Amino acid sequence: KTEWPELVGKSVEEAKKVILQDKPEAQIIVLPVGTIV
Amino acid sequence: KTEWPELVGKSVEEAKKVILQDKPEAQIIVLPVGTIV
């Protein structure tokens, strides 16, 4: 699983819980929208 | 309904209430003007 379209609109906390459940090793980075990466 | 020109100038709270009434599933994202999407 590489994408989480079910998380659009949800909080960071709920996104993190869902991602770590699907992907235990995930390194979760939180950035404002529009941030150049 | 895809657009809400009646909400220009209104608060986020009033925009949200109106949008969710017209579109129950809406996932409401709030960004500063000028944000690149």
Binding site: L7, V12, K23 | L31
Partner: peptide
């Protein structure tokens, strides 16, 4: 492209604004 990383792009209320993807 980093397979263990997941970026969360958040709005002004810290809600997820875009679909999260590995990378």
């Amino acid at each position: 492209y980093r397979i263990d990383r997941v970026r969360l792009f958040v709005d002004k209320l810290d809600n997820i604004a875009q679909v999260p993807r590995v990378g």
